[PDB]
Structures are given as structure tokens and as C-alpha cells.
């Protein structure tokens, strides 16, 4: 399966802006603890924030090309996940990039990394969120 599936949220200028904050309050002082101490409380609070609403999501859509979001939805938020486990139950639906994607409870999307990438056609900033998919401790 692929290991790299991107889907986009059109997020609020007020929200986003919270995202970014959380998510880099996160990179910076969550996911070290989850990947230097393997730490179970870091991988809950991990899930708990649930930074790209994605949480006990069974059959959530993504695409392997960035670009498909951005000409269909042209998102300003882009979620990045990068899967190499394939703890993400991918499948193929469709289009032949489109993917149907399942979160398992003990499976964390690891923010690591929160990214300038253009502008939307609005004119918007648009910023990408990085993840990594990993195994509960």
C-alpha cells in the first residue's frame, strides 16, 4: 500500500492559526517524549488533540497526489500522512489515486512537522501538517 496520503480541511483564518500553535506546541514538546522515551501518556495526548480530525475514522478519503486536493477542494490545510507500517488500512477506491483510509485506537498520527506550501486560489496561506503513523508504545 501506499505509505504517503494527503487529504485537505477548508479551515477558518482564526482556526488555522490555533492549528498551527497546537500542532508545533506538540512537535516541540509532545512527540519528543513519544519518540525518545516511548512514553504511553505522550501517545495519548497524541490522540486526544486529534490535530486533523481524524480520530476512530473508518473509511476517511485521501489521494496520494497533493495536487487532486488542491484543484478539488483547494484546501488551505493539507494533512500529510506518511504510513510506511501501513497501520492505515488502505484501499483503493476509484481517480486511481484515491485511497479509503481506517485509524485504529492504538494507532497515533505523530505531528512532526508544520510546513508553508503557496497560496491558495482565495489567496489564502496554505500550510501543510506532517504526520507519521505509529504503533502505540
Known sequence: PPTRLFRGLNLSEEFTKGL????????????????????PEAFKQIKLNDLSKMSGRTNASTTTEIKLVKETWDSNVIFEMLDPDGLLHSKQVGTA?????????DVALVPVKVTLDGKTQKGENRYVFTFVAVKSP
Open 97 to 105: 489515486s484515491a485511497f479509503s483510509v481506517y485509524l485504529p485506537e
Open 20 to 39: 498551527i500553535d497546537q500542532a508545533n506546541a506538540m512537535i516541540a514538546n509532545t512527540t519528543e517524549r513519544l519518540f525518545t522515551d516511548h512514553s
